[PDB]
Amino acid sequence: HQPLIARDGPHPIEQPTHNYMTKIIDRRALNAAFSLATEAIALLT
Amino acid sequence: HQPLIARDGPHPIEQPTHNYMTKIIDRRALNAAFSLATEAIALLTGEAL
Numbered sequence: 430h431q432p433l434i435a436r437d438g439p440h441p442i443e444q445p446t447h448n449y450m451t452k453i454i455d456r457r458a459l460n461a462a463f464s465l466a467t468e469a470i471a472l473l474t
Numbered sequence: 475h476q477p478l479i480a481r482d483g484p485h486p487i488e489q490p491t492h493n494y495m496t497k498i499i500d501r502r503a504l505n506a507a508f509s510l511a512t513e514a515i516a517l518l519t520g521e522a523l
Contacts, residue, residue, distance in 0.1 A: 457482055457484075458484060459480035459481075459482070460480060460481075460484060460485075460486060460487060461478060461480040461487070462486065462487055462488075462489070462490065463490055464489055464490065
């Protein structure tokens with residue numbers, strides 16, 4: 430909502446305005462990898 | 475433990491690196507000398523008493 434002051438005289442008298450904004454979310458992802466050897470699982474028995 | 479960051483790019487980090495460091499220490503050995511005289515031996519022993 431824009432405030433509009435009373436500007437007077439011979440000036441063109443204007444009306445209060447409205448604006449509406451829509452924003453699309455930018456989306457990202459992450460990658461974190463950890464490697465396990467096949468022998469490391471065999472130690473977990 | 476190598477600390478990691480999940481970078482914003484979807485490109486793969488391919489592996490993390492976590493390993494063990496082993497270090498061989500070293501060795502050094504100190505020195506001194508105490509030398510005693512001839513007649514000081516017999517006096518401590520008792521041969522000249």
